[PDB]
Structure 1
Amino acid sequence: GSTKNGRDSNPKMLGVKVYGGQTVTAGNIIVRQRGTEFHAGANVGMGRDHTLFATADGVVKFEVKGQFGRRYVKVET
């Protein structure tokens, strides 16, 4: 006979692009994510596809905050 499987989708290259302690410029993308695994803090904007980008020049920092305990990424000038 034959098999009904044998299909897959092309890769999407998701994940973190700039790690904590690094330097960024305004407009640099920091996180590529399907959902909001990370949220935006100061000087970080969110795109329509949930991408996180930097709106200011500085140093990236990750943190855990809030009652929900969700993770935030921000830029320090």
Structure 2
Amino acid sequence: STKNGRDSNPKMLGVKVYGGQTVTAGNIIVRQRGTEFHAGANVGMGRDHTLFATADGVVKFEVKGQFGRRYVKVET
């Protein structure tokens, strides 16, 4: 009899809206366990590190700053 045989239910993480798409305020952009992406302009961060839009516009990804963090912002 094996001592293995367990696993957890899937969580369905990942990028939900890609660069160049238009969003409405409140749209979820990234589901992530940790801050793989950071919130830029017009983007808010939830209690579970979810990134969402706070304004209408076009999503844009970039690499910026002195640490080389990945940012996602919304351009109005």
User: Scaled by the length of structure 2, what TM-score is found?
Assistant: 0.99
Cα distance in structure 1, aligned partners of 2:73 and 2:34: 18
After superposition, the C-alpha distances for 1:15-41 in whole angstroms (9 at most, x for unaligned) are 000000000000000000000000000
- Shift in Å at residue 73 of structure 1? 0.2
**Structure 2: gaps (5+ residues):** none
Gap runs ≥5 in structure 1: none
Q: Which entry has the higher C-alpha Rg, 1 or 2?
A: 1
CA RMSD of aligned residues (A): 0.3
- Paired residues, what number? 76
Q: Structure 1 CA distance, aligned partners of 2:75 and 2:63?
A: 16
SS of 1:45 mapped into structure 2: strand
Aligned match of 1:39: 38
Residue 75 of structure 1, CA deviation:
0.1
3-state secondary structure, aligned to 1:37: coil
| TM-score, scaled relative to structure 1 | 0.98
Shift of 1:58: 0.2
Provide the rounded CA distance (Å) in 1 between the counterparts of 2:40 and 2:13. Answer: 21
